[PDB]
Amino acid sequence: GSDEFTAPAEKAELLEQSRGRIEGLFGVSLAVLGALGAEEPLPARIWLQLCGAQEAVHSAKEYIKGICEPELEERECYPKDMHCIFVGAESLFLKSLIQDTCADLCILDIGLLGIRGSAEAVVMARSHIQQFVKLFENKENLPSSQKESEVKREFKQFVEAHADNYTMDLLILPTSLKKELLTLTQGE
Numbered sequence: 001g002s003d004e005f006t007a008p009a010e011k012a013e014l015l016e017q018s019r020g021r022i023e024g025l026f027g028v029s030l031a032v033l034g035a036l037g038a039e040e041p042l043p044a045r046i047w048l049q050l051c052g053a054q055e056a057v058h059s060a061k062e063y064i065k066g067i068c069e070p071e072l073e074e075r076e077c078y079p080k081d082m083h084c085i086f087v088g089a090e091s092l093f094l095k096s097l098i099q100d101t102c103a104d105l106c107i108l109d110i111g112l113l114g115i116r117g118s119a120e121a122v123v124m125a126r127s128h129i130q131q132f133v134k135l136f137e138n139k140e141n142l143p144s145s146q147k148e149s150e151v152k153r154e155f156k157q158f159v160e161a162h163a164d165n166y167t168m169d170l171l172i173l174p175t176s177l178k179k180e181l182l183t184l185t186q187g188e
Contacts, residue, residue, distance in 0.1 A: 079136060083110050085181065
């Protein structure tokens with residue numbers, strides 16, 4: 001399918017530069033359309049055409065609108081030991097979160113994320129991160145189970161496939177958080 005919408009003309013260079021990224025994130029194709037009829041139109045906006053699967057195009061449109069004309073820009077604080085989630089595993093958890101929420105997520109400092117885009121994308125992203133933090137914080141010694149071992153094994157295989165300086169920090173995350181992180185990446 002395809003969707004046509006506008007962006008401020010000034011964002012032409014941004015969108016041209018970001019085509020690759022946007023396709024890589026959402027699996028869509030992005031083109032900037034012409035402006036015919038001799039005369040420049042009043043709003044000075046450029047038309048974009050997105051092509052691909054329906055929900056993929058919907059997500060990408062929301063992201064593109066978010067980075068061109070964000071409705072919200074917010075911060076999110078998180079515990080320092082959770083930082084591995086956002087910079088570890090070759091940034092794949094952060095990438096999945098961007099794909100899932102359609103918010104633009106930026107690592108500002110250890111323990112600090114910047115979140116921008118459409119209001120609903122930003123609201124969703126913040127809610128998801130606060131939820132990760134909740135799982136991370138109330139962690140205590142808990143029951144052993146086969147189900148726990150399968151999640152730990154699956155999580156370890158994923159992170160070991162993308163090994164870096166954060167691998168050990170990721171491996172000591174609570175199993176509940178590991179499960180939500182797997183859900184997040186496998187859903188994308």
